[PDB]
Structure formats: C-alpha cells, structure tokens
Design an enzyme around this catalytic site. Sequence first.
Site, mmCIF file in Angstrom:
data_model
loop_
_atom_site.group_PDB
_atom_site.id
_atom_site.type_symbol
_atom_site.label_atom_id
_atom_site.label_comp_id
_atom_site.label_asym_id
_atom_site.label_seq_id
_atom_site.Cartn_x
_atom_site.Cartn_y
_atom_site.Cartn_z
ATOM 1 N N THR A 77 0.717 -1.195 -0.013
ATOM 2 C CA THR A 77 0.049 0.065 -0.021
ATOM 3 C C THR A 77 0.924 1.417 0.157
ATOM 4 O O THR A 77 0.660 2.313 -0.771
ATOM 5 C CB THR A 77 -1.009 0.032 1.156
ATOM 6 O OG1 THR A 77 -1.508 -1.418 1.227
ATOM 7 C CG2 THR A 77 -1.910 1.049 0.854
ATOM 8 N N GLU B 50 -9.187 -8.340 2.848
ATOM 9 C CA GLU B 50 -8.319 -7.943 3.850
ATOM 10 C C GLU B 50 -8.812 -7.710 4.928
ATOM 11 O O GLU B 50 -9.587 -6.690 5.182
ATOM 12 C CB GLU B 50 -7.385 -6.502 3.308
ATOM 13 C CG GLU B 50 -5.868 -6.646 3.082
ATOM 14 C CD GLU B 50 -4.962 -6.843 4.107
ATOM 15 O OE1 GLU B 50 -5.956 -6.707 5.298
ATOM 16 O OE2 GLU B 50 -3.926 -6.972 4.139
ATOM 17 N N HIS C 233 -4.996 -10.530 9.164
ATOM 18 C CA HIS C 233 -4.064 -9.244 9.327
ATOM 19 C C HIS C 233 -3.736 -8.580 10.689
ATOM 20 O O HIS C 233 -4.984 -8.109 11.052
ATOM 21 C CB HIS C 233 -4.239 -8.186 8.164
ATOM 22 C CG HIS C 233 -3.015 -7.328 8.011
ATOM 23 N ND1 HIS C 233 -2.767 -6.726 6.619
ATOM 24 C CD2 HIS C 233 -2.029 -6.954 8.808
ATOM 25 C CE1 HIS C 233 -1.654 -5.980 6.723
ATOM 26 N NE2 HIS C 233 -1.198 -6.099 8.110
ATOM 27 N N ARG D 249 -0.391 -3.275 11.916
ATOM 28 C CA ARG D 249 0.959 -2.883 12.261
ATOM 29 C C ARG D 249 0.535 -1.878 13.387
ATOM 30 O O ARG D 249 1.551 -1.841 14.432
ATOM 31 C CB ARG D 249 1.332 -1.987 11.123
ATOM 32 C CG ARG D 249 2.626 -1.199 11.610
ATOM 33 C CD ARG D 249 3.409 -0.919 10.276
ATOM 34 N NE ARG D 249 4.695 -0.299 10.855
ATOM 35 C CZ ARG D 249 5.821 -0.262 9.946
ATOM 36 N NH1 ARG D 249 5.679 -0.848 8.826
ATOM 37 N NH2 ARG D 249 7.093 0.205 10.384
HETATM 38 C C1 LIG Z 1 0.189 -4.196 6.579
HETATM 39 C C2 LIG Z 1 0.514 -4.447 5.233
HETATM 40 O O1 LIG Z 1 -0.425 -4.603 4.494
HETATM 41 C C3 LIG Z 1 1.992 -5.255 5.059
HETATM 42 O O2 LIG Z 1 2.446 -5.251 3.651
HETATM 43 C C4 LIG Z 1 2.050 -6.577 5.935
HETATM 44 O O3 LIG Z 1 1.139 -7.490 5.483
HETATM 45 C C5 LIG Z 1 3.325 -7.331 5.820
HETATM 46 O O4 LIG Z 1 4.224 -6.303 6.174
HETATM 47 P P1 LIG Z 1 5.133 -6.551 7.807
HETATM 48 O O5 LIG Z 1 5.616 -7.911 7.740
HETATM 49 O O6 LIG Z 1 6.413 -5.695 7.923
HETATM 50 O O7 LIG Z 1 4.126 -6.551 9.121
HETATM 51 MG MG LIG Z 2 0.762 -5.092 2.454
#
Ligand SMILES: CC(O)[C@H](O)[C@@H](O)COP(=O)(O)O
Ligand SMILES: [Mg+2]
Lengths: 214, 215
Positions: free
Chosen positions: B35, B111, B135, B138
């Site tokens: 994203t 998602e 997910h 973060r």
């Molecule tokens: C938040 C998002 O879409 C990221 O690409 C995620 O899925 C994977 O990245 P991280 O392993 O750094 O958390």
């Molecule tokens: Mg991502």
Amino acid sequence: SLPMLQVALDNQTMDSAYETTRLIAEEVDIIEVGTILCVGEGVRAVRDLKALYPHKIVLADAKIADAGKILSRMCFEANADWVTVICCADINTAKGALDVAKEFNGDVQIELTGYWTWEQAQQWRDAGIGQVVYHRSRDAQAAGVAWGEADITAIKRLSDMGFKVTVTGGLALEDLPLFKGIPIHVFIAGRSIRDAASPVEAARQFKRSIAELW
Amino acid sequence: SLPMLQVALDNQTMDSAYETTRLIAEEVDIIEVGTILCVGEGVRAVRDLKALYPHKIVLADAKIADAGKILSRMCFEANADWVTVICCADINTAKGALDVAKEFNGDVQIELTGYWTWEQAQQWRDAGIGQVVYHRSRDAQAAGVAWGEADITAIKRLSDMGFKVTVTGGLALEDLPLFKGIPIHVFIAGRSIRDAASPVEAARQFKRSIAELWG
Ligand SMILES: CC(O)[C@H](O)[C@@H](O)COP(=O)(O)O
Ligand SMILES: [Mg+2]
Ligand SMILES: CC(O)[C@H](O)[C@@H](O)COP(=O)(O)O
Ligand SMILES: [Mg+2]
C-alpha cells in the site's frame, strides 16, 4: 460559517485532473486528490496540486486502512492539509495519523464508507478526531441505494457528538435542501462538477444554493 | 500443501523496492506491491514489477474501500495478478472487483484489517471470494497486540468456511510454529525480510522453517 465546497478529482492522471482544475480551482474551497488519483499517480499528485493552488485546502483522499503514521506522513510531507482514514481502521491507526497531522498543522478525517458502529464513533471522538465524512458509497449508489431520512438522522447525530461533518456521494444540486438545518462543514461534488456541461456554472450553482440555505 | 512466502514491498519509492527485489525475487513466491508503494509511486509500481518478474504472482495491496470496479481495473490494466479489498467495504465493491478480476484472469482477496463480522464473512463466500488475509494491524502490533488464541480460532473458522487464508502482520520466524497444523495458504513477511542483515538468508530461513513445520 457557510458549508464549504470541495471538488473531488477522481481522475487517473494529473493531466486529466488539470482539465477540471483549470476551470474550477478558483470556484471551490477544497481540492481533493481522489483515491483514484492517489492510486493512479501517487503522492506526487498532492505535491503538484498544492504547488499549483497553495491558497486552497488540499485533501488527500487516501482512505488509510493501516500504517497510519507512515502513510499520513507521506501525504503531509507532500504538503496535504487533510488526510482521510477509513472507518474500519484500528483505532491506533486513526491516532497515529492524527499525531503526525498535528506535527504539520494538518487534520485527519474519518471516512465513513462501508460498515462502522456508533461505539467506534465515540472512540474517534475520545481520540481527538474532529472531522468525519458521511459518504454514500459509489458502489452502493450504483446498486440503487438512495439518500434517505436514516442518513439525515445519522448526520445530525454525528454533528451532535461534536464532529464537523462532510457530506458526499453522488451529490446533485437538487440534494442540498435535504440537509437544510444542519451545520454541515463541507459538501463534496466530484461527478456533478467534473462531468457537467459547464463545470464553472455547476460549481457556482452549488455555492449559490449553499448561500441561499445557510 | 506448504504455505507459500510473499514479500511485501512497503517502500516509498521504486528504487528502494528494487534494493529488495534484486536480492529476493527468486527466493519468494509472491511479490506484493505494498500500500505504501502504491501511494508513493502509483500503479506504475505494479506495471514495472510485473515487467521485471513476469513469471511471479504480483499482488497490488490497494486495500480498495469503494469504487471496486474502477480501482481494480487500474491495477489489472497495470498487469496485477491479485488485488486486495478491505473488509469494511460494501459487498458490491468486492463483487465489482471480482468481476473485473475475472476479465483479466486474476483474483481478489479480502483484507481483514480492523473491524469486521462473521455475517460479513458469509457474504464474501456467497459472492465468490476465495481468499482472505488475516492481518494483525501494524498499528495494533505497535500498541502491544500479540498473536493469540482468538487469532488461531478465527483463522481455523475462516479456513473451514472454504477461504484460503494468508497470515500477516509483523511476522517473525519465531511466530510460525503458532500456526502449525492449519492449512495456511500464504505467509507474508515485510520488515522481517527487507530489514534483515541478509534479506536472502531471512527468506531462506522462512522457507526452511515452513518446510519443516508443514512437511
Ligand atoms: C500491513 C501490510 O499490508 C504489510 O504489507 C504487511 O502485510 C506485511 O508487512 P510486515 O511483515 O512488515 O508487518
Ligand atoms: Mg501489505
Ligand atoms: C467516493 C469518493 O471518495 C468520491 O471522491 C466522492 O466523495 C465524491 O465524488 P462523487 O460526487 O462523483 O460521488
Ligand atoms: Mg474521494
């Protein structure tokens, strides 16, 4: 004061957006870099439009879903005034975006497209969010969903909770009286201004009808 | 069937992304245009990565919230294989993206980032969605939210409903054993690969671990 008028640039390229801004930039208060334009061109769209129209509020309609501090900072570093965060985002997403916005003297709007709850809305308020966008989804519009009294009841409730409310979603000139009485912060028009036979007259009629009603 | 490995390119510019892909493109199964990269560069990021790696699945993590047909068409015209639609979107958004995807022999994932419900989930299945991304936000992870029991339960129920489930959100190598015994489709790693001292060695470690845990 009066409700402001925002134009949504839901274009795929900058040159297509400029076909509209060259007609109406001086006729509106807020220029929105639409989600479509953010995806088409990236954050350069925000930087370019703010350079062109620095006296206007520029909104990056990014509909941030996660990584609030990272995405908001990209937009604000590109000189955005306001950014949108989607209503289903984790509350810490909204909070992170708002923290960055304060660093740049900007602001965050919660974009109410799709599913959300009144309990989430109290959360945004407690987090310090002052703006929401009441949005009849485009895809919902295309499946026959109309504006109705349940929308007006919901806008009023949000306003009474202390949010500044933006109203949008296939708005037509003729829709404005539905919202009479309510201290609406902003009305957005995308298609009804961009695709009008005369975008300048379309924008001016919006401003005229707002001045009539408020 | 082993979980596949997906690298998330959550970089702000293409050249930063290429610092990663030159190392690991052949060590992973799926290349995700994150994203952050979609917002940083636009959909040219998808076009350019697919041109570099045409034999790989390229995922545009656009997290489409509305305007399903228009945004999905932009990603697919740029040669994406998969696009993502956020869980809170109106059902017609997902349907609209899925119709476009079928024209381009692609696919759509929902998602699951932030709030959603199990009635929402059934609507996705009825509508023909075959993939979800479980997910851990973060921003939630940064505020202390760890992987847990409710997560495992939810993932198993999604899989039993018939979805192929991708798992992501700050995954580290030591997290993989938590998911053992569940038929995970894909694990996504972003930071734990891109930011490693050796991204190649981090990717190989994930692959070895997966081959042990699911083999
Ligand atoms: C938040 C998002 O879409 C990221 O690409 C995620 O899925 C994977 O990245 P991280 O392993 O750094 O958390
Ligand atoms: Mg991502
Ligand atoms: C859906 C979206 O974000 C659009 O910019 C919307 O707010 C305004 O444009 P329309 O007036 O063409 O529905
Ligand atoms: Mg918009």
